[PDB]
Amino acid sequence: DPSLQIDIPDALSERDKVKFTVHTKTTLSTFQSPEFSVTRQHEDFVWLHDTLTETTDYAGLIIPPAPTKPDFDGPREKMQKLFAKMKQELEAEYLAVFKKTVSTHEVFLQRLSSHPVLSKDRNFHVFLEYDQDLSVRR
Amino acid sequence: GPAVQFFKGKNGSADQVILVT
């Protein structure tokens, strides 16, 4: 796996959407650049998962499960309604949700990067590399 | 309106959250 290394170093929750920075380091000449980053929303991860599941050539392969939709409704309701004690627990709550959802999204990508077949998939490469919003693409 | 930004601390640092807007 050392030729393709993916991590999510930061993320942003705004209104009802969560954007993740997806950072790639690779030694593969099947990517344009050895290190790059893109912004991806949760929906884009769901699209990538579905696309793989629907690729008939991959039937039988172990496709890692999609990350679940992050849930910031509770924290966001506290934030709006809302002292230093109460504000500290709010940040802790946000932080706990972020650590979990960043982990699930990152693990999905890391599992794809390790798979000898799925790591080569064109849609996976687009997901990592394409330096525009994928939502409009699809 | 409101937005909250997360930074992973990774190996050495610890994680941070910042209220934006």
Author numbering:
A (entry chain A): 28 to 109, 121 to 176
B (entry chain B): 111 to 131
Give me lines lifted from the publication on this model.
The core of the retromer complex is an evolutionary conserved trimer consisting of VPS35, VPS26 and VPS29, which recognizes specific endosomal cargo proteins. The largest and most well-characterized protein family controlling retromer activity is the sorting nexin (SNX) family, which is characterized by the presence of phox homology (PX) domains. One of the effector proteins is IncE, which specifically interacts with SNX5/6 via their PX domain. Overexpression of IncE in mammalian cells inhibits retromer- and SNX5/6-mediated endosomal trafficking.
To understand this interaction in more detail, we solved the crystal structure of the PX5:IncE109–132 complex. The protein crystallized in P1 space group, with two SNX5:IncE dimers per asymmetric unit. The structure was refined to 1.9 Å with a final Rfree of 0.213. The resolved model contains residues 28–176 from PX5 (one copy of the PX5 residues 110–120 not modeled due to poor density) and residue 111–131 from IncE. In the complex structure, IncE binds to a hydrophobic groove on PX5. IncE forms an anti-parallel β-sheet, which extends the three anti-parallel β-sheets formed by residues 36–62 of PX5. A long protruding double helix in PX5, together with its β strand residues 36–40, forms the hydrophobic groove for IncE binding. However, the protruding long double helix is bent toward the IncE-binding site, with the largest movement being 11.5 Å for Cα of Ser115, which is located on the tip of the double helix. IncE interacts with PX5 through an extensive network of hydrogen bonds and hydrophobic interactions, resulting in a buried surface area of 646 Å2. PX5 presents a hydrophobic floor by the side chains of L133, F136, V140 and the aliphatic side chain portions of K137 and Y132, which forms hydrophobic interaction with IncE residues V114, F116 and V127.
